[PDB]
A paper describes a structure:
Studies have shown that soluble [name] ([name]), the receptor for [name]-[name]-2, can neutralize the virus by acting as a competitor of endogenous [name] and thus has potential as a therapeutic protein. Other studies showed that a fusion protein consisting of the extracellular domain of human [name] (hACE2) fused to the Fc region of human immunoglobulin IgG1 (hACE2-hFc or hACE2-Ig) had long lasting effects, can bind to the receptor binding domain (RBD) of the spike (S) proteins of [name]-[name]-2, and can neutralize [name]-[name]-2 in vitro and in vivo. Here, we generated an optimized, binding-enhanced, and enzymatic activity-eliminated hACE2 mutant (hACE2-[name]-[name]) fused to the hFc that can effectively neutralize both [name]-[name]-2 WT and several variants.
Additionally, to reduce the possible side effects of the rACE2, we impaired the enzymatic activity of the hACE2-[name] by introducing an additional mutation at the R273 position ([name]), which is a key site for enzymatic activity, generating hACE2-[name]-[name] mutant. As expected, we found that the enzymatic activity of hACE2-[name]-[name] was nearly eliminated with no difference to that of the negative control. Interestingly, the affinities of hACE2-[name]-[name] for all RBDs were similar to the affinities of hACE2-[name], and both were 2–3 times higher, but ~14 times higher for Delta and Kappa RBDs, than that of hACE2-WT. To elucidate the molecular basis of the binding-enhanced hACE2-[name]-[name] interacting with [name]-[name]-2 RBD, we solved the structure of hACE2-[name]-[name] in complex with Gamma-RBD at 2.7 Å resolution. The overall structure resembled our previously determined complex structure of wild-type [name]-[name]-2 RBD (WT-RBD) bound to hACE2-WT with the root mean square deviation (RMSD) of 0.478 Å for 667 Cα atoms. Residues contributing to the interaction between hACE2-[name]-[name] and Gamma-RBD were listed in Supplementary Table S2, which were almost consistent with the WT-RBD/hACE2-WT interaction, with similar contacts. Due to the aromatic side chain of phenylalanine (F), the hACE2 with [name] mutation enhanced the hydrophobic interaction with Gamma-RBD with additional 11 contacts. Compared to WT-RBD, Gamma-RBD with K417T mutation destroyed the salt bridge interactions with D30 on hACE2-[name]-[name], as well as with E484K mutation, which abolished the salt bridge interactions with K31, that both mutations lost five contacts in total. Gamma-RBD with N501Y mutation introduced additional 20 contacts to hACE2-[name]-[name] and added the π-π interaction with Y41, which resulted in the higher binding to hACE2, that was consistent with the SPR assays. When superimposed the two ACE2s in the WT-RBD/hACE2-WT complex and Gamma-RBD/hACE2-[name]-[name] complex, the RMSD just was 0.359 Å for 489 Cα atoms, which indicated that the hACE2 structure remained stable with [name] mutation.
Numbering used by the authors:
A (entry chain B): 19 to 614
B (entry chain A): 334 to 527
Amino acid sequence: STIEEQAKFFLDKFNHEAEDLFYQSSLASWNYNTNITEENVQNMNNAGDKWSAFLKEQSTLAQMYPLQEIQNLTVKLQLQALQQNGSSVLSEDKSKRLNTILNTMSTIYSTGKVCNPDNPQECLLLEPGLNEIMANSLDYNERLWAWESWRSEVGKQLRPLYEEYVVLKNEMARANHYEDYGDYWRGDYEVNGVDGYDYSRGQLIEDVEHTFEEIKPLYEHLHAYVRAKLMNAYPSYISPIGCLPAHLLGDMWGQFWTNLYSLTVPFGQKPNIDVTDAMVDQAWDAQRIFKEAEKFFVSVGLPNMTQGFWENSMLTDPGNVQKAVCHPTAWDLGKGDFRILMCTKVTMDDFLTAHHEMGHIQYDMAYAAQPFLLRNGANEGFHEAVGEIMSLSAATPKHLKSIGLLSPDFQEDNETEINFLLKQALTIVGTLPFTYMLEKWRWMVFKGEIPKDQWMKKWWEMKREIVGVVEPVPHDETYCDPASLFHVSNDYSFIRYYTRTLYQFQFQEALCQAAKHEGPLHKCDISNSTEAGQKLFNMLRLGKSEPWTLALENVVGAKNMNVRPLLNYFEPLFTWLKDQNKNSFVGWSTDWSPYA
Amino acid sequence: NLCPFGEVFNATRFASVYAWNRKRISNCVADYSVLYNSASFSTFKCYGVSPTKLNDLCFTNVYADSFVIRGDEVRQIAPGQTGTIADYNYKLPDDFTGCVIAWNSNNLDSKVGGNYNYLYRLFRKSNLKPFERDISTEIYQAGSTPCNGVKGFNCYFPLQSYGFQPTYGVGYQPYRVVVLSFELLHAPATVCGP
Ligand SMILES: *[C@@H]1O[C@H](CO)[C@@H](O)[C@H](O)[C@H]1NC(C)=O
Ligand SMILES: [Zn+2]
């Protein structure tokens, strides 16, 4: 037999045992997240350990079939996905040292306490306390205390660990033949061997910076509008030509500007629409919400939820009888078992995340016929982009009338649309400079372009230059402000939040032309469009079996990430912001500081 | 006297598809009426012969083959089909005269921890001839290097288990299958209808 035939036999054996062991680890993980008992933790860890040990030995076996001798593309992708997954060429002592660092940083983040200057027994955690201040406080001093202390108590603890974390992760990346840990993260977008669809690891950096250049004009006018509104919220605290202080952005870091909506609302006399009151009046329960979300996907030609979905999912809080992790998640246990984990309430928000999370399930169901190792999103940004566009259509006033939650003769003023679009921009657009700047700093840190003696100096130089945000107090190199964010201190890639955001508006734009939508892009509902459901399904069914550039082409007709669909969604707001900023200065000086 | 159909369909345990069980049925009056109008079979496909007409003609020898497979594999129990089950476990002849009967047995053949009683053969040197049975457990040689009975790289154990659990999707749930083969020859014909 040839090497390719031998590898196909190896995957046939692997797929059977992997599906069994992955199901057992998923069922044990499900039982813990739906019922937190000590016995369920032990069953989850042991089943997870058995799965991790299995992947490690199968990865070493998969490396025994050389990639260069395989000709079938589907076999090559499965072997490559197994040779890289479960590989641990780091030394034993350095692997334990890295894991200890990772666990120490995670514990510092989740247990770090900040105590009041007045009372040292009154202590606040980030998880329920500092975040509440940063999201709801209108007091300049209270926000500055929470912002600066989190970085003074917790941030300074992570700095020595993050220094060793960088070099140890770079060693792990070189053991997998990547240039550094940043290069290793960018390997998710790599495509080799397919003529016309290839994509190099360095191409992601150039494509991210090229798209961001076209985002700058829209962000600059969003920045200028928010600044002028913030000068009235905090008079004598904000320069009309300077950056925004970091502690006044609506959360601990400025990741999203969503909580600034109450200070920057375009028309504060027109309330945003909310069908929460209509659901309670019509006696909606959690089952109705998910039955309605099921009707949405069926309306575009997608399949119904399986009978096991309704029997095995957890769509309400179990109660006091069982303690559960109340965090909306879509589960793909394998073997045709799909469930949603949600403590649903009868609110418009939970109604929308149901369409989001069912979107994941539709994605998982579509590529279930793929081989095991290809049952994943095209790249790391495809899945959440699919869930987000479900929420986009389900939230439109067209859709809410169709299901009886809005009145038939409800009228949409352009003022309420500008209100809606600005709330969207604060979340969607406001996070894009934050995300790009954060990963860029991490990329240059990993490859050594930013030495440790300039970590915080360069960090706040790019916060000023790229994001237009300035520190309220100066920070020397004893600080580690990046690590104060969960993703940086818990070792999670971040650029996916940038690429996914561009993907989702590429998808929605392409699906709305297939749905023959006429008006502005943000008013579009793909419901009852068989052609829109088929265009999306022709990608969902692929999984990882094709390069992500081909998967994107099946939907949008182009092979690359493009930012024009995003700019088209916010075009009604872009024109409005430009007129509001006629009297104001657009852009920012990097010289001004609240402490200077 | 009636035919032992209740012993085949209502059996406590079915066989594994790789060791599918065969029972020859003769010297009895068959009541196919209880069968084709049971409303509990998800698959009742007949080839050559006709349902609701089997209660008329006598047959020389009637064979009943039974086993358990998963739902997505029931399509392979048909003439001229291809797959792990049709190739290596149970092969129906291309010119098959008989009926394929299948029903969901999740309530009987699934345990929460996983039911490892039902196996299937994953590898074989060649495809199975029609109605052939392979119950050997010889190590399969996937490469050119000999195995010499050692399980390892390119040397696999040929039987795998379904691990049926009740929370599986319908395509992975256990399905009990009964294949009825009919033949008429110039021999004492003792399988008639009422
Ligand atoms: C199996 O037994 C049940 C009684 O429990 C009976 O109703 C059914 O008809 C039997 N099936 C066959 C094929 O004889
Ligand atoms: Zn999601």
